[PDB]
Symmetry: C2
Subunit: 248 residues, 2 copies
């Protein structure tokens, strides 16, 4: 844990437990400003991932996310938004979380250390060399994710790692390593903060960019939207009008 | 929908469906840089919310999040991280999502328009004037959330609104209005992007700041961590050492 930035103490928060409410949120905001800068540095790798994901998609493959705790939950979150936004099948982008569905709401004892469970999770969805696997873990050393990436790599599938520590074991295994160096968290080890934000930003790019390139968009209009409520239904009507000056 | 920034088209993405992969992710990154700036503007309101949440917590109340779709999922995500990070009961911070558990993975037809369902959802957890209710909706007009805030307000509970459009109906009802003006999304109406990031950042501040003030922290060390895996167990040992120069 001593060689991980994610586990490092932030010099600016040493006396955070003695600072005013405003000073605490201000400090959190200043650190937040650093996350977009950390992603900018990874754009070349993120872009490559999108290119590779689009090709896989065109080959009939799926985009698979794996992770534990918060990282896993973010993969589930991003995946859940693809069908309603781009009108795609729920199978196109799948988010897998260590520990199963119970892990979405709460932690599952030793879930991220189960190196055998990930193989079962991937075999259950018939993971194949045609799919793309994105391993998400701020530490870059989550056993469950390392094993998932190793398995996928051995099968012949393209692998991508998203982690917050440089030269991680995950990055050493993955074909494409996205390293979001966000720096020490305000609360030491609280990766749910800056790394969580970084992961959401990267995941959003992987799906948004890939879906746009696949045609699930016209100009900057969400033409493949799945209206499931009044707002979205009213937006669908609005889109049609914006694309071609007509009326309701 | 024509008076909502969230539904506005972004001038910089008009031909996004015709741009290279790198140009797409770059544009998304430039827009992302704007989110922390949008939060900075709300710090005074966010800080006030924390102060009020801490008092409620000290009075025995809970922090309750309500939202639909992505907004609801983020409230669930933030809530799920409090027990393992601050060692608190699962009842202290609760995330409620329109549509029930099914809504975590996928959309539930008309869930965000059900103004009666929110009353049932709040009554089920015995919501009271002693609790604090945070209504989360980028549009600021989600019927399910508006009704939730109205009910809570009438009961006598402190209410907080988090939305991305100024002077929303939610902000008009809530006691404290946090307005994260992030600007038009790259994909028109795709609030899962900038507004989602903004909401996560605000929620993270509400719980991190409040928990720190309650003593669920020492210096910047996560002393109340709940070790559920080798990493966290190794961190607990590390924390003890960092606080007082001892050894394993």
């Amino acid at each position: 844990l001593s060689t991980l930035i994610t586990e490092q103490r932030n010099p600016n928060s040493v006396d955070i437990d003695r600072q005013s409410t405003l000073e605490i949120v201000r400090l959190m905001n200043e650190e937040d400003k650093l996350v977009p800068l950390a992603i900018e540095s990874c754009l070349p790798q993120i872009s490559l991932a999108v290119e590779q994901i689009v090709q896989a998609f065109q080959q009939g493959g799926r985009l698979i996310y794996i992770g534990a705790g918060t990282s896993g939950r973010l993969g589930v979150l991003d995946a859940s938004e693809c069908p309603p936004t781009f009108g795609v099948s729920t199978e196109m982008v799948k988010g897998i979380i260590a520990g199963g569905e119970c892990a979405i709401r709460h932690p599952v004892e030793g879930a991220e250390d189960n190196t055998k469970a990930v193989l079962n999770d991937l075999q259950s969805i018939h993971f194949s060399k045609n799919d793309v696997l994105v391993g998400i873990a701020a530490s870059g050393r989550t056993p469950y994710v390392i094993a998932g990436l190793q398995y996928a790599k051995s099968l012949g599938a393209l692998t991508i790692s998203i982690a917050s520590n440089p030269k991680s074991e995950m990055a050493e295994i993955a074909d494409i390593a996205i390293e979001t160096i966000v720096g020490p968290e305000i609360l030491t080890g609280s990766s749910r903060l800056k790394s969580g934000t970084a992961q959401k930003m990267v995941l959003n790019m992987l799906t948004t960019a890939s879906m746009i390139l696949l045609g699930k968009c016209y100009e900057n209009l969400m033409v493949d939207v799945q209206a499931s409520n009044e707002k979205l239904k009213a937006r669908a009507v609005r889109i049609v009008m914006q694309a071609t000056d007509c009326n309701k």
